[PDB]
RNA sequence: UGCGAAAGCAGUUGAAGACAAGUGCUUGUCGUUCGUUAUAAAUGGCCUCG
């Protein structure tokens, strides 16, 4: 995904369908960030128990 | 895609070259039959050469070179030579002419004619209205 | 003092919160610590975004001719 | 809004040391920061000055609570990137390394905080459950 | 899992060994955290391009 | 199958054999390969150098 | 004056400063200044008004011969 | 001869071809006889497009001379091989190598051309029909190729194994021409 | 063809060189072997392709 | 390029000669030298034996 954005920045502007393919992607990648942050939190407290 | 050289008197095959990747639609040769130029669907113009004296004594052709000059098929090819002219003119589905030199086909320069040269105008504009 | 390189102080603090234990911690002070940590997490996320950013024809057109 | 923008524009032309104070003015909002960058930062010299001031400030205190200066940096990088790298000043490259070094720490600092945040959250919940 | 640790935290503390019996949990949780540094990097680039055409 | 003796190097003897296959076998009988040797020196000819389409079998 | 790929303008009241793939033409055929090549190829060029110039321009599957890129 | 940039000797060992800076010129000389003595600038051989293009196209990395002296193969850093007919300096372009060609060698009869380079693939160009036979996945890049025998029974190759940057790891490979199997490594 | 099943029991020397064909390659593996980088990517995203 | 962990911390990328092109001047190159720790792009992709 990093390459295609770095390689098709201009085609991105002129294509609407590509734009929504990122909008949902940004929402999904954001959701993964929340899970990974959440996983770190359960990881932190699990250390406290032991 | 094959170019074959047949002996006329015996009606037998002398040489076969699997040169093109698709149909060979047109062939042409120079005045002295030192070069044979083939072109077709694969957009390439192949040169077969027998200019060397050793080639002539043995009557063996050599797949000297090829060039990719067209964006589409090459339907027609023709050649002309004189004391002041040396042309290899080709064209096809691209709708444009390409001009090369027969003697210096491998390394010589080439010209791609404009698709439309409006010697006769197909458009007019009216200043009023 | 904390509520008032930093990880080597914070990671040390995380060791404190493990050493102190669940029971010994007090709710009143814990709230202040929670407000502090949530403050740093927001900032740390902000800086991470900045760091990544640093690492990162018409049919008819009207024009004026110069003559 | 218009007054501060005109003041900031004048200070950039005047090489004033007050450029930083203009940038921290509370009147600034995100949309006009975008408008200022797109409309008024038309010369590379002005762009370099704003980056140098912001980057130097952030380098000194990357943990400053004022989100405005980071907000300037974010949109300045997002909107004007193609020519920020076009700036060939050596000091501009050096200050970029300093800024990256300061922020690079913070990215390393984040995972520890999230763990500390998590262990506290359990403690608050357990205390609440014990109370109930 | 989050509620199990919170509610039964007292009982879990009084266990002779946790890592050997909770080894799978720690490994599973460790993998998710490793995504966070790279996901932020991807997110920043997505935001950089996402901001770009939205204003344009 | 057929014997072959090099017209120049009389010491060179060889057997060529072929069948309804896309390969040919050559068996070098030179020196003591024919009788004394415990093993046979066999080579397989299977490469036509771009002319596979013309040839389907080495049998003839 | 305009051709297939060029447009030119010449003022006839002012004198100019004095300072291969075609027949060599050894044989006979029988028996103030503006130049631009930005606009091409041209179907037709002419003036709509005194200050308006109308330039008209030109706006199939092929055998695939890939271009290697590393 | 002065300022010798590149040199090669025929398989028979009776002709010498060499490139000198007297840009550059190629000269071929009979070594035991005066029968062959020719010289010509490299500019005549080089294509005009090469003169337009970068220096890789005009840089010769390999050179081979036929036993009869009728043909001379020049390999370029671009990967393009050009066989030159010495009688009339006619060029023939053979283009398969994507990177620089390191080894060129003619067969004894001159009808085949061994070529090798960074591809780790040895190509026998059949010059009658311009075809080619391949031996790929060799152990290293081919520094040198030779046809070694009265009837071309064997091919002797030198391999480099460029993975090891610390040292140059040469390997000598003697292949059976009949079935292209390693007769002696 | 009455000798197809002899198997050379009574013979002095048996010579074996037959090599079994490699296991059938998929479309994506063939494209990679032939240096078809773009087509290999296309074979990645096709209906009914294992994740 | 030096050190170091993998993160990173410091420091470089100069001078002459020759050739080519354009117009003594400008630019670019070097199978040329001295000194310092110091994009690519000739349509050009890998064998057969079931």
UniProtKB/Swiss-Prot annotation, chain D:
Cellular component per GO, a single term: nucleus
GO molecular function, one term: U3 snoRNA binding
Keywords: Nucleus, Phosphoprotein, Ribonucleoprotein, Ribosome biogenesis, rRNA processing, Transcription
Compartment list: Nucleus, Nucleolus
GO biological process: maturation of SSU-rRNA; maturation of SSU-rRNA from tricistronic rRNA transcript (SSU-rRNA, 5.8S rRNA, LSU-rRNA); positive regulation of transcription by RNA polymerase I; tRNA re-export from nucleus
Organism superkingdom: Eukaryota
More about this protein: Present with 20000 molecules/cell in log phase SD medium.
Subunit structure: Interacts with snoRNA U3. Interacts with MPP10. Component of the ribosomal small subunit (SSU) processome composed of at least 40 protein subunits and snoRNA U3. In the absence of snoRNA3, forms a complex with other t-UTPs. This complex can associate with pre-18S ribosomal RNAs.
Function: Involved in nucleolar processing of pre-18S ribosomal RNA. Required for optimal pre-ribosomal RNA transcription by RNA polymerase I together with a subset of U3 proteins required for transcription (t-UTPs).
Protein name: U3 small nucleolar RNA-associated protein 9
The organism of origin for this protein: Saccharomyces cerevisiae (strain ATCC 204508 / S288c) (Baker's yeast)
Swiss-Prot record, chain F:
Disulfide bridges in this chain: none
Swiss-Prot/TrEMBL WD repeat ranges: 1-37
Function text: Involved in nucleolar processing of pre-18S ribosomal RNA and ribosome assembly.
Subunit architecture: Interacts with snoRNA U3. Interacts with MPP10, UTP21 and UTP25. Component of the ribosomal small subunit (SSU) processome composed of at least 40 protein subunits and snoRNA U3.
Subcellular location: Nucleus, Nucleolus
Miscellaneous notes: Present with 9570 molecules/cell in log phase SD medium.
Similarity-based family: Belongs to the WD repeat UTP18 family.
Name of this chain's protein: U3 small nucleolar RNA-associated protein 18
Curated annotation (Swiss-Prot), chain G:
Subcellular location: Nucleus, Nucleolus
Note in the entry: Present with 5440 molecules/cell in log phase SD medium.
Known function: Involved in nucleolar processing of pre-18S ribosomal RNA. Required for optimal pre-ribosomal RNA transcription by RNA polymerase I together with a subset of U3 proteins required for transcription (t-UTPs).
Record note on quaternary structure: Interacts with snoRNA U3. Interacts with MPP10. Component of the ribosomal small subunit (SSU) processome composed of at least 40 protein subunits and snoRNA U3. In the absence of snoRNA3, forms a complex with other t-UTPs. This complex can associate with pre-18S ribosomal RNAs.
UniProt-recorded name of the protein: U3 small nucleolar RNA-associated protein 4
Species per Swiss-Prot/TrEMBL record: Saccharomyces cerevisiae (strain ATCC 204508 / S288c)
Complete-protein stretch covered: 648 to 776 of 776
Curated annotation (Swiss-Prot), chain I:
UniProt-recorded name of the protein: U3 small nucleolar RNA-associated protein 15
Additional notes on this entry: Present with 358 molecules/cell in log phase SD medium.
Function: Involved in nucleolar processing of pre-18S ribosomal RNA. Required for optimal pre-ribosomal RNA transcription by RNA polymerase I together with a subset of U3 proteins required for transcription (t-UTPs).
Compartments where found: Nucleus, Nucleolus
Record note on quaternary structure: Interacts with snoRNA U3. Interacts with MPP10. Component of the ribosomal small subunit (SSU) processome composed of at least 40 protein subunits and snoRNA U3. In the absence of snoRNA3, forms a complex with other t-UTPs. This complex can associate with pre-18S ribosomal RNAs.
